[PDB]
């Protein structure tokens, strides 16, 4: 088995602007390389392959170069569908293998978050549980701290996170915190906030609901 | 013109087997070869070995020479894998692609996850993200669904059957303490539509046949 | 077994000339060259593009087998890359040759007492020949500004010159029978392809 590495693992850039990415091969495997794009739950999507041929569909700014240990993919000016994950896989009998990928974001205008935040529904207040919702909408760069405040107390151990891919038009993320309690523990409580802070807002800000519509 | 459907997911429990199936169109399915690729999350793809449906012929790697055996009808054009002695760490996104022989794919499946787990289909429960109420200067407002507690994955979210697609966002599901999954899904409306429009979200989750369409709308 | 018929190709009794070199497309065969590649009989055996092991291991649409006869000093031409008299104006090899040269030593057979004047050769040529280029036309060479009319002159030459291939002329003069094997990858089925990796 031939093992290969790309480099980066990882990069952001512009729409535009022009990239390349590399693969590294243990063996020489001549011409035969093909590049693969991928983006979340769907299939690989052929780019290139030996080495330089486009596959059918696939615009004229991708280019495949290299040869024998050294491979480059190229996109002469990015696009925003362009993010994903790229792999590299020499195509010289058996068996075929692939590389660790290439993630790429799309760089992009620093943009503020849409904080909503979101009670228990009745209907999961008689279940037992109660989840509360903080929604962050549309932002770039994807990092972002939520903290959930109860009366103004830190809360850990309680919330779990989920992020959206890169939007295809937008190039922005949405991220969703959400807080699980017991219904005898949210009564205790009476404020619930949450506290988003990202590069976009020059000051934590918060959100936040007294229970009961109170 | 060139489709390659593949199953639906799939939930096992550990040490059973499964048969995974492509079904091919648009081409010769007897002068190609039908390549099977295995993805984990958070990894690159593993090839795992190609049948060559004209003559029946099949290779492998060696890790996967016991766990999978390859199989092509040529009468419904079906490509199989099958899949024994099943363990956690089979578990994975399985791709059928097209293989013209050079060991290059330019056709894909579109996947079929295979769950491995002693645990059991359990149903979602839909709750409401009710529209908040603010001044909504600049008219955008949000609302959305909780789906909460299924197993296992996936469920599809729709708004309006289909009819919203603009500003909704679906969130990946995270995996609870307790074994089961949660997720939502959230839209942006204009706030002056909220007493106007009414808006649904249609949540299936296939291997317990749940239809849910929960409708929001603000409390009190 | 549908072994590809390669046998035909270099066991023929007689072979081309290099100017009319000859060309046999070959496909839906199973093609083991690794038996041909550890050969002592193959005095040249140079692959291109491709690994000598890696040969079985690989799948073509269509290989194509070119055979001719050239003196032994001549098949470094043969090579992608090359110039000269032969790659200039009898048979050229593209830049990107992916494929397999062979050549052997052929004075038992394409030798005789005055020595063989069948075998011919492209001594003039007004241009270069492309890659996998074939012109056979005798016309007569104007390499100066008179017109020839067809007439064999002092600026005006016949296109095609005679090896001697006396049987006695020395390695280098010797006649050598080269079999080339290009591989076609092409977007469509494969065709062509190794030994079952079963064995
Ligand atoms: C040309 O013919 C010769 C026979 O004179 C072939 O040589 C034999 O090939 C078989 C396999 O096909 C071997 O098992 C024998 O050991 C070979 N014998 C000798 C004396 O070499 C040869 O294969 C033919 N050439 C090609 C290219 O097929």
């Known amino acids: 088995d031939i093992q290969m590495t790309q480099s980066p693992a990882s990069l952001s850039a512009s729409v535009g602007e022009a990239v390349t990415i590399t693969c590294r ?162 009564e205790k409580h009476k404020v619930y906030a949450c506290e988003v802070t990202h590069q976009g807002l020059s000051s934590p800000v918060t959100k936040s609901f007294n229970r009961g519509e109170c | 013109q060139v489709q390659l459907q593949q199953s639906g997911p799939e939930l096992v429990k550990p040490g059973a087997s499964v048969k995974i199936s492509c079904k091919a169109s648009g081409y010769v399915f007897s002068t190609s070869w039908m390549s099977w690729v295995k993805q984990r999350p958070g990894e690159g793809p593993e090839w795992i070995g190609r049948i060559y449906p004209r003559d029946g012929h099949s290779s492998s790697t060696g890790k996967f020479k016991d766990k999978a055996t390859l199989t092509a009808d040529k009468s419904s054009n079906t490509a199989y894998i099958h899949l024994s002695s099943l363990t956690s760490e089979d578990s994975a996104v399985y791709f059928c692609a097209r293989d013209y022989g050079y ?84 839209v942006t409306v204009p706030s002056s539509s909220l007493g106007t429009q009414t808006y649904i979200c249609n949540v299936n989750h296939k291997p317990s046949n749940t239809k849910v369409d929960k409708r929001v709308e603000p409390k009190s | 077994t549908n072994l590809c018929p390669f046998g035909e190709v270099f066991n023929a009794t007689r072979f081309a000339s290099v100017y009319a070199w000859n060309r046999k497309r070959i496909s839906n065969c199973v093609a083991d060259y690794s038996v041909l590649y550890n050969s002592a009989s193959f005095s040249t055996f140079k692959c291109y593009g491709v690994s000598p092991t890696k040969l079985n291991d690989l799948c073509f649409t269509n290989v194509y087998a070119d055979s001719f006869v050239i003196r032994g000093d001549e098949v470094r031409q043969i090579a992608p890359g090359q110039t000269g008299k032969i790659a200039d104006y009898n048979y050229k090899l593209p830049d990107d040759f992916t494929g397999c040269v062979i050549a052997w030593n052929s004075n038992n057979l394409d030798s005789k007492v005055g020595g063989n004047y069948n075998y011919l050769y492209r001594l003039f040529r007004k241009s270069n020949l492309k890659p996998f280029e074939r012109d056979i036309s005798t016309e007569i060479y104007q390499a100066g500004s008179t017109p020839c009319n067809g007439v064999e002159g002092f600026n005006c030459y016949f296109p095609l010159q005679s090896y001697g291939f006396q049987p006695t002329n020395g390695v280098g003069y010797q006649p050598y029978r080269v079999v080339v094997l290009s591989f076609e990858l092409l977007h469509a089925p494969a065709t062509v392809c190794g030994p079952k990796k079963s064995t």
């Open chain 1, 25 to 186: 091969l243990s063996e020489n495997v001549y011409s035969f390389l093909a590049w693969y794009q991928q983006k979340q739950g769907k299939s690989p999507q052929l780019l290139v392959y030996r080495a330089k041929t486009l596959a059918e569909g696939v615009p004229s700014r991708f280019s495949g170069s290299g040869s024998g240990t050294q491979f480059s993919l190229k996109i002469n000016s990015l696009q925003p569908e362009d993010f994903g994950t790229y792999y590299c896989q020499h195509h010289y009998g058996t068996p075929p293998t692939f590389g660790g990928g290439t993630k790429l974001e799309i760089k992009r205008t620093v943009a503020a978050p849409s904080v909503f935040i979101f009670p228990p529904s009745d209907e999961q207040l008689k279940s037992g549980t109660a989840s509360v919702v903080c929604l962050l909408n549309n932002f770039y760069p994807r990092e972002a701290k939520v903290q959930w405040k109860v009366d103004n107390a830190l809360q850990s151990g309680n919330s779990q996170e989920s992020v959206t891919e890169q939007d295809s038009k937008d190039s922005t993320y949405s991220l969703s915190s959400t807080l699980t309690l017991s219904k005898a523990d949210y």
């Open chain 2, 103 to 186: 060991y290059y794919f330019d056709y894909w499946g579109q996947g079929t996850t295979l769950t491995v787990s002693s645990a059991s289909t359990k149903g979602p429960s839909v709750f409401p993200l009710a529209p908040s109420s603010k001044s909504t200067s600049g008219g955008t407002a949000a609302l959305g669904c909780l789906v909460k507690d299924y197993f296992p994955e996936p469920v599809t979210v729709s708004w309006n059957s289909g009819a919203l697609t603009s500003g909704v966002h679906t969130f990946p599901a995270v995996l609870q303490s307790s074994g089961l999954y949660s997720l939502s899904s959230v």
